[PDB]
Design a protein around this nucleic acid. Structure first.
Ligand SMILES: [Mg+2]
Ligand SMILES: [Mg+2]
Ligand SMILES: [Mg+2]
Length: 127
RNA sequence: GCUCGCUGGGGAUACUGCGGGCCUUGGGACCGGGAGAGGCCGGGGGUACCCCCGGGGUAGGGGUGAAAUCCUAUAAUCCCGGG
């Protein structure tokens, strides 16, 4: 019939990870990060690295019979930043251009109800 | 005039003091329907986070103005089921 999967996208200020699994989440189809396609640490979070990694992952998934995906995009969350980096939308767009159908899109950043304390002291980074 | 201080008598009763009597405006007591993260004791939860075990996957993850120490083939980062 139709084999649908899930694309988990992890976006921070330092890197991007694109991880395609099956509908239940328990079996991995492909997994590509920014440091696997570019050679400079400075370029790992850039949008272009996101496009390259997304294209590699989409090809590997298409060869194995996946037809479309649902998307789950997240920032680090927790006691770290709640805002996704610059490579989220670029990764989302490059999946559709590569041949997959796109289902529903949502963000699953984990948000505390007044949880743990953040690193940096009571004055924070002083640069 | 000064030593502004003392002492014997007579008079007055507004104010202050002392004795009695009568009040309710200040203050306190009590009754009614409501408001509030006021305090203490007992019970039940919420996400997040860290560690441990099992399944997948395979070469990087993390971090900076730029880097390196550090973590990772005893299988990490990432995803799933439990404690
Ligand atoms: Mg890297
Ligand atoms: Mg300075
Ligand atoms: Mg394991």
């Amino acid at each position: 019939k139709e084999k649908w999967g899930i694309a988990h996208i992890y976006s921070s200020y330092n890197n991007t990870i694109i991880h395609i699994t099956d509908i239940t989440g328990a079996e991995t189809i492909s997994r590509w990060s920014g440091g696997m396609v570019v050679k400079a640490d400075r370029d790992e979070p850039s949008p272009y690295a996101a496009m390259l990694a997304a294209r590699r992952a989409a090809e590997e998934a298409l060869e194995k019979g996946i037809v479309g995906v649902h998307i789950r995009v997240r920032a680090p969350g927790g006691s770290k930043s709640k805002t996704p980096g610059p490579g989220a939308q670029a990764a989302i767009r490059a999946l559709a251009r590569a041949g997959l159908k796109i289902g529903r899109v949502e963000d699953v950043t984990p948000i505390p109800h007044d949880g743990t304390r953040p690193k940096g002291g009571r004055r924070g980074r002083r640069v």
